[PDB]
C-alpha cells in the first residue's frame, strides 16, 4: 500500500515521459565522425561546408537531416581506448591531403580494420586535388611510391592513390565512397548525403528483415 | 423396427484434411506463441515489432479456434447459440491476418522509397494506427457472418450472394496486387543501389507472395463459385466435395506466415533466451 | 654522461627485485588451504532498472546504500531510488561524450566528466529546486576517467595525459598533481582512510600515491596489459587490478608485491570493474562475455557466475554496507543482485 | 635535456627503495583473520534471510 | 408448415406401416436423393408407393428454405 | 532569492465570486507543487486545496471542495484559486505555500506573505495539542508535544509529521519534517522526537527569537492542530 509519495511516483512517471520525449527527438539526427591527418584538409571541408580542447561538434542542417559532424582529432591520446566511444556512428568522413601518406595510409588501415567499424561505411574525401596539379608538375610521384609504373599524369596519379587507399579494405560487406574535394563545396555535401541516404536505407532494410 | 435403412453419412476423401488441421495446430500453436512472446510488448518500444506483433495475435487467436473445425468436419456438420458467434471470429481472424499482412508490406514499401520517413516522422503510435485501421476494416468485411448465421432442421434431430464479390476483392485481390506491386518496386530500387543489394531479399520476398498466392487462390475461387450458383445445378458436386480441404488448406499459410518472420530476421533466438 | 645514471637506475631495478623477492617466504595460494571455501554462489536480478535508452557507461553507489547514479551516451546524468524504481532526478549534460561519475559522500553533489576534458560538478539541494552546474573544472588534455570524492569541498580525478590531480572545488585550481606514469591512466581508487589512493595505467603498470605529500610511494607492475579497474580490499591494506588480459590480479601495500592470481582457460576477453564485497571474502569483475563472474578472493576459484545481460557490462559497484550490487552494461540496464 | 627528468626518476626509484617490507606469510594472515572476522556480516557471503533483505 | 403437409399426406395411409414409411420419406437426406434410396427399403409396394410422394414433395419444398447451411468455417 | 506572493483581497459581497492569484519567482515553478492554506483570525491554520506538478492531480478539503477550483499556469509561473458562494466562515488570510515530492526532499519549505479576505453578514484523521500556552524565558529548555487519533508512522519506516512555526506579524516557517529531520537555515537547537501517536518537538537554550505559536501537522493521506503559544 502506498503513502502520499504517490506524488514522488507520478514524478518519476513525469520525468520518464519527459526522457522518452527528447530521446525521440534527439534520435532523428545522424551522427557522423569526422576524422584525418593533422592539417589534412579537415579544416577546408568544414569551412566550405559553410558552417574544448579535446572533441568538438560541428553542427549543420541540409535536406531536412540535421548531420552532427564530430572531430575527434583535437585529442592526443591511446587512440585505441577513446576510439570504441564513438560505436553506431553511421558513417566516418575520412579525408587525406594528397599534397603531403605512408602514415594517413596506416592511420587509415587501423580505423578500417578495427573491431568496432567492422560494418560502417566510409566515405573518403581525397583533398588538395587543385595544387595537386602543380605538385605532380614539379615532382614525379614515385619518390613517393617507388613500385609505381606507368605515366606521371593528374589522373591516373589520383586513380592509382584512390586504388593503394581501397585495396586496404579487408572485409567486402562495406562500401567506400571516394570523391574528390575541389576545394568548392555546394557538391561534396550532396556526395556525403548520398552514402547516408544508402547508409539509412541498408540499416532499415536489414532490420526490418529483408536481410 | 429398424428405424432406418442406410448408413448416416460417408467420408469422402476431402474428409482427409484432418490431418493438415491437426498439422497447422499441433506447429502454429506452440511455434507462434513462442514468436508472439519473443514479439511481445516486453519486446516493444521498437515499431518493426508491432506488425508482426498484430499477426502473430491474429495467427494464435485463428489456430486456437481452429478445433471447432476439427470437431466439426468428422461430427457430420452438426453445430448451442455459440455456432453463430464463432465461425464470424474464426473468418475475422484469418482477414485480420491478410490486411495486417498487406499493411506490413506497404509500411516497409514506404520505408525504402522515402528514406527520410522512417526516421523523421514513423513512430509506434503509427503502427498501432496502421494496425488498428486494417482490424477495422476487417470487421466491417466481417459483419455478414455476424447478420446471417443461423441453424435449423427438422425431421432430423442428430443435426442442425452479391456480398461474396465485396469480400472476395477486398480480402484477397486488392491485398494480391498492393502485395506484388510493392514488392517488385521495391526489389527494383533496392538492385539499383548496388550497395544496399543483396540476393536474401528475393529469398524471403518471392517466398512470401508465392506462398500467399498458392495457398488463398483455392479457397476463394471455391467461395466464389459456392456462393455464385445458389442453383444447387449437379456441377457444384466436385467443388461441394472439396470445400473442406480448400477451407483447410487456407491455414497452411496461416501457419507459415511465422516461419518466415523467425528464420529471416537475425535469429531472435537471443531475445527468447534472454527473456 | 646519461648513461652512468641509467646504469645507476638499473642497479636500482635489480636490487629493488631482489629485495621483493626476498620476502616471498610462502604464498597466500599455499596458505589458504587450510580455511573451507565458501561453496557455489548465486543470485537473481531483483530489479532490472531501464530508465536509460543508449549505452550505459557508469555509475556509483550513494553513501545511504539506497540512491543510484548513472551516465550514458544519451547524455542523460540520472539518478536512481534503487528500493523503489523511481527516478528523482534528471539532468541534461552539456555533452553527451562520459566516461565516469561520482556521487559526494554526504549526498549534495554529483560529479560527471568526459571526453571535453573538463570535470562539471553538479548540485543537488539548490534552494531555486532544480540542479545546477557549480563548477566546471579544466587544466587537463586528456579524457576524464575517473573521478572520487574525498568529500564536499576536494575532487580527485584521472585523466588521459597520465596526470592525476586533486582539486579545490571552490576555487577551481588544480591545489596538487601526481605524475609518473607513462601511458594514460584509466582508472582510480581511494582507500577509506582517504589519505591514499592508487591508480591504473595502459603502461600494465599500477601504483600508490599521498594525497598530501603527492609522491610517488610504490609501483606494482604484475600485468602484461592495458589496466582498466582498480578498487581497494575493504581494510586498505590491498587491492586488486582488473587488465584486458582476461585475469586479476591482487597486490598487498606492505609486502609491495602480487600475492595471487585469477583466471580460467575458457575466458581470453578484457577486464571493465573490478570491486570487493563488504567482507573482503568475495571479488566481483566484469567481463566482455556479456556477463559478471564472482571470486572467493582467498581462494581464486570461480565460484558463481551472474550472467544475464545481452551487452558487454561497463560498471559496477557494491553499497558501503554489503546488502547488494549492481552493474550496468551497454544493453542500456542496470541489474540488482542479491 | 633529459637528464633531469631521467635524474628525478632515476630518484624516485632509489626513494621507493628504501621502504621497508613485510613477509607475504604475514600478510595473507592479515587478510584471512579480516576475512573470517567479517564473513558473518556480510549477507553476500552469508545468504541473508528474506525477512530481512529489503530488496526481496 | 412442413410437417403440417408431410402430415395431411401422410393421414391417407390404410395402416401405421404405411404412416411410418411416409414419415421416413421427410426425412431430408444429402448424401443420396430420395428416388434410388427408395430402392432399399425392404417392405411391400404399398411402403415404398408412400415413400417415394413424401420424399419428393418433402426434399422439394425443403430446398428453397432460407439460406445456404454454408459456412464450416468459411 | 524566492518570492511567493499573493492578491484578490478586501472585501466581498455574501454569495458572491472572487478571483485569487498567487505569483512566483526565483525558482522552477513546473517543477513544483502547490497548497493553499488559511488562516481564521481567532483559530488554527486549515487546508484548502491542493495541485500536484503540471497539474496532474488536484484535492480539496471536503467543507470547501466545490465551492473552490485551483489551477497553475506554468508559463506564467502563477497559480489561480476561483471562489463562488463565499459564506462567513470563508474569511481568513490565504497563504500560497510551496512543495516537492522526492525522496529526501522536505515539503512546505516556504510561505508567502498572505491576503486578508473578509466578507459581510447576510478518515479526517484529527491532531490534538494539550495546551493553547505555556510560559518560559529565555536560556531555559521547554517541550511541545501534539497527539493524532491515528498512528501517523507507516509500513515504509517513517512518519509524517511536521512543526511549524508562525512567529506575530509574519508567516509560517518549516522547522520539523519528518518528525526528526531538521529544515535548511533552521538552527540545529530544535529537535523533534517520538513514536506511534505520541510525538514532542523540544527546544533548549531557548531564545526570543522563538517566541511565537507552533502548529502541528500531519501528512498521511488526503489537516493542523490547535496551536500553542509560547509567551516571555
Redesign the interface.
Known amino acids: 500500500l502506498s503513502a502520499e509519495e504517490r506524488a514522488a511516483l507520478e514524478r518519476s512517471k513525469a520525468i520518464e515521459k519527459n526522457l522518452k520525449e527528447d530521446g525521440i527527438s534527439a534520435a532523428k539526427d545522424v551522427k557522423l565522425l569526422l576524422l584525418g591527418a593533422d592539417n589534412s584538409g579537415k579544416s577546408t571541408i568544414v569551412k566550405q561546408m559553410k558552417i574544448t580542447t579535446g572533441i568538438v561538434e560541428t553542427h549543420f542542417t541540409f535536406k531536412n537531416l540535421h548531420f552532427r559532424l564530430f572531430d575527434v582529432g583535437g585529442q592526443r591520446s591511446e587512440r585505441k581506448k577513446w576510439i570504441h566511444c564513438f560505436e553506431d556512428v553511421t558513417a566516418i568522413i575520412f579525408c587525406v591531403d594528397l599534397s603531403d601518406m605512408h602514415e594517413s595510409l596506416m592511420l587509415f588501415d587501423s580505423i578500417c580494420n578495427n573491431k568496432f567499424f567492422i560494418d560502417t561505411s566510409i566515405i573518403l574525401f581525397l583533398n588538395k586535388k587543385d595544387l595537386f596539379g602543380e605538385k605532380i608538375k614539379k615532382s614525379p610521384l614515385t619518390i613517393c611510391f617507388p613500385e609505381y609504373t606507368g605515366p606521371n599524369t593528374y589522373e591516373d596519379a589520383a586513380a592509382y592513390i584512390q586504388a593503394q587507399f581501397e585495396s586496404k579494405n579487408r572485409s567486402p560487406n562495406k562500401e567506400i565512397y571516394c570523391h574528390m574535394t575541389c576545394a568548392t563545396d555546394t557538391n561534396n555535401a550532396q556526395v556525403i548525403f548520398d552514402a547516408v541516404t544508402d547508409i539509412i536505407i541498408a540499416n532499415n532494410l536489414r532490420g526490418c528483415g529483408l536481410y | 423396427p429398424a428405424d432406418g435403412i442406410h448408413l448416416p453419412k460417408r467420408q469422402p476423401g476431402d474428409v482427409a484434411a484432418l490431418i493438415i488441421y491437426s498439422v497447422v495446430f499441433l506447429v502454429g500453436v506452440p511455434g507462434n506463441a513462442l514468436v508472439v512472446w519473443v514479439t511481445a510488448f516486453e519486446a516493444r518500444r521498437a515499431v518493426n515489432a508491432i506488425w508482426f506483433l498484430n499477426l502473430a495475435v491474429a495467427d494464435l487467436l485463428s489456430c486456437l479456434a481452429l478445433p471447432v473445425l476439427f470437431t466439426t468436419v468428422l461430427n457430420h456438420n452438426y453445430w448451442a447459440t455459440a455456432c453463430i458467434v464463432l465461425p464470424s471470429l474464426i473468418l475475422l481472424n484469418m482477414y485480420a491476418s491478410i490486411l495486417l499482412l498487406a499493411t506490413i508490406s506497404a509500411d516497409r514499401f514506404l520505408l525504402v522509397f522515402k528514406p527520410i520517413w522512417c526516421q523523421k516522422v514513423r513512430g509506434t503510435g503509427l503502427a498501432w494506427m496502421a494496425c488498428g485501421v486494417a482490424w477495422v476494416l476487417a470487421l466491417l468485411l466481417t459483419i455478414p457472418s455476424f447478420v446471417y448465421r443461423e441453424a435449423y432442421k427438422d425431421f432430423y434431430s442428430e443435426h442442425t450472394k452479391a456480398v461474396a464479390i465485396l469480400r472476395l476483392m477486398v480480402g484477397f485481390v486488392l491485398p494480391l496486387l498492393t502485395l506484388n506491386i510493392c514488392y517488385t518496386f521495391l526489389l527494383l530500387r533496392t538492385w539499383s543501389r548496388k550497395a544496399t543489394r543483396s540476393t536474401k531479399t528475393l529469398k524471403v520476398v518471392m517466398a512470401v507472395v508465392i506462398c500467399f498466392f498458392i495457398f488463398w487462390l483455392p479457397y476463394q475461387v471455391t467461395g466464389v463459385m459456392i456462393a455464385w450458383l445458389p442453383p444447387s445445378s449437379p456441377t457444384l458436386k466436385r467443388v461441394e466435395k472439396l470445400n473442406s480441404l480448400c477451407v483447410s488448406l487456407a491455414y497452411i499459410n496461416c501457419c507459415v506466415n511465422p516461419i518466415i518472420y523467425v528464420m529471416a530476421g537475425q535469429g531472435f533466438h537471443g531475445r527468447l533466451l534472454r527473456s | 654522461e646519461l648513461d652512468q645514471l641509467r646504469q645507476e637506475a638499473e642497479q636500482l631495478k635489480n636490487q629493488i627485485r631482489d629485495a621483493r623477492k626476498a620476502c616471498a617466504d610462502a604464498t597466500l595460494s599455499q596458505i589458504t588451504n587450510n580455511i573451507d571455501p565458501v561453496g557455489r554462489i548465486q543470485m537473481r536480478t531483483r530489479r532490472t532498472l531501464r530508465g536509460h535508452l543508449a549505452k550505459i557507461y557508469a555509475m556509483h553507489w550513494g553513501t545511504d546504500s539506497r540512491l543510484l547514479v548513472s551516465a550514458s551516451q544519451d547524455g542523460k546524468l540520472i539518478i536512481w531510488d534503487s528500493y523503489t524504481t523511481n527516478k528523482v532526478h534528471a539532468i541534461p549534460l552539456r555533452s553527451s561524450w562520459v566516461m565516469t561519475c561520482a556521487y559526494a559522500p554526504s549526498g549534495n553533489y554529483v560529479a560527471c566528466g568526459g571526453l571535453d576534458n573538463i570535470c562539471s560538478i553538479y548540485n543537488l539541494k539548490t534552494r531555486e529546486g532544480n540542479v545546477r552546474v557549480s563548477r566546471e573544472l579544466a587544466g587537463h588534455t586528456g579524457y576524464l576517467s575517473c573521478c572520487r570524492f574525498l568529500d564536499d569541498n576536494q575532487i580527485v580525478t584521472s585523466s588521459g595525459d597520465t596526470t592525476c590531480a586533486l582539486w579545490d572545488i571552490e576555487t577551481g585550481q588544480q591545489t596538487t598533481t601526481f605524475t609518473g606514469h607513462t601511458g594514460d591512466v584509466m582508472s582510480l581508487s581511494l582507500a577509506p582512510d582517504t589519505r591514499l589512493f592508487v591508480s591504473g595505467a595502459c603502461d600494465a603498470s599500477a601504483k600508490l600515491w599521498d594525497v598530501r605529500e603527492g609522491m610517488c610511494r610504490q609501483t606494482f607492475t604484475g600485468h602484461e596489459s592495458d589496466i582498466n579497474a582498480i578498487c581497494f580490499f575493504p581494510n586498505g591494506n590491498a587491492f586488486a587490478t582488473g587488465s584486458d588480459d582476461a585475469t586479476c590480479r591482487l597486490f598487498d601495500l606492505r609486502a609491495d608485491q602480487e600475492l595471487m592470481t585469477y583466471s580460467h582457460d575458457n575466458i581470453i576477453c578484457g577486464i571493465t570493474s573490478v570491486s570487493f564485497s563488504k567482507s573482503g571474502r568475495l571479488l566481483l569483475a566484469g567481463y566482455d562475455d556479456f556477463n559478471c563472474n564472482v571470486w572467493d578472493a582467498l581462494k581464486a576459484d570461480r565460484a558463481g557466475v551472474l550472467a544475464g545481460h545481452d551487452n558487454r557490462v561497463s560498471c559496477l559497484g557494491v553499497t558501503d554496507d554489503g546488502m547488494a550490487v549492481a552493474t550496468g552494461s551497454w544493453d542500456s540496464f542496470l541489474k540488482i543482485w542479491n | 635535456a633529459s637528464i633531469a627528468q631521467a635524474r628525478k626518476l632515476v630518484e624516485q626509484l632509489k626513494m621507493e627503495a628504501n621502504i621497508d617490507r613485510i613477509k607475504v606469510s604475514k600478510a595473507a594472515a592479515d587478510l584471512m583473520a579480516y576475512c573470517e572476522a567479517h564473513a558473518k556480516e556480510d549477507p553476500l557471503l552469508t545468504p541473508v534471510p528474506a525477512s530481512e533483505n529489503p530488496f526481496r | 408448415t412442413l410437417q403440417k403437409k408431410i402430415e395431411e399426406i401422410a393421414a391417407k395411409y390404410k395402416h401405421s406401416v404405411v404412416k411410418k414409411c411416409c414419415y421416413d420419406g421427410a426425412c431430408v437426406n444429402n448424401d443420396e436423393t430420395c428416388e434410388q434410396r427408395a430402392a432399399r427399403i425392404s417392405l411391400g409396394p404399398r411402403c415404398i408407393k408412400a415413400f417415394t410422394e413424401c420424399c419428393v414433395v418433402a426434399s422439394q419444398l425443403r430446398a428453397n428454405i432460407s439460406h445456404k447451411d454454408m459456412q464450416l468455417g468459411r | 532569492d ?1 518570492q511567493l506572493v499573493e492578491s484578490g483581497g478586501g472585501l466581498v459581497q455574501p454569495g458572491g465570486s472572487r478571483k485569487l492569484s498567487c505569483s512566483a519567482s ?3 515553478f513546473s ?3 502547490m497548497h493553499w492554506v488559511r488562516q481564521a483570525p481567532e483559530k488554527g491554520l486549515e487546508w484548502v486545496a491542493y495541485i ?3 497539474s ?2 488536484i484535492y480539496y478539503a471536503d467543507t470547501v471542495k466545490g465551492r473552490f477550483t485551483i489551477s497553475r499556469d506554468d508559463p506564467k509561473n502563477t497559480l489561480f484559486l476561483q471562489m463562488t458562494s463565499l459564506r462567513s466562515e470563508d474569511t481568513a488570510m490565504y497563504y500560497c505555500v510551496r512543495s ?5 526532499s522536505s515539503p512546505f519549505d516556504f510561505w508567502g506573505q498572505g491576503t486578508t479576505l473578509t466578507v459581510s453578514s447576510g478518515s479526517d484523521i484529527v491532531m490534538t495539542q494539550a495546551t493553547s500556552s505555556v510560559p518560559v524565558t529565555p536560556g531555559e529548555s521547554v517541550s511541545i508535544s501534539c497527539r493524532s487519533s491515528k498512528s501517523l508512522l ?3 519506516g ?1 512518519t ?1 509529521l511536521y512543526w511549524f512555526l508562525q512567529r506575530p506579524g509574519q508567516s509560517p516557517q518549516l522547522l520539523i519534517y519528518r518528525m526528526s529531520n531538521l529544515a ?1 537555515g533552521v538552527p540545529d537547537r530544535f529537535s523533534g522526537s517520538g513514536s506511534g501517536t505520541a510525538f514532542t518537538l523540544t527546544i533548549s537554550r531557548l531564545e526570543a527569537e522563538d517566541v511565537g505559536v507552533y502548529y502541528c501537522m500531519q ?3 488526503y489537516t493542523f492542530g490547535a496551536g500553542t503559544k509560547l509567551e516571555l
Open positions: 524566492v526565483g525558482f522552477a517543477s513544483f507543487g500536484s506538478s503540471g496532474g492531480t516537492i515530492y522526492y525522496y529526501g507507516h509500513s515504509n517513517n509524517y535548511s501528512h498521511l493521506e
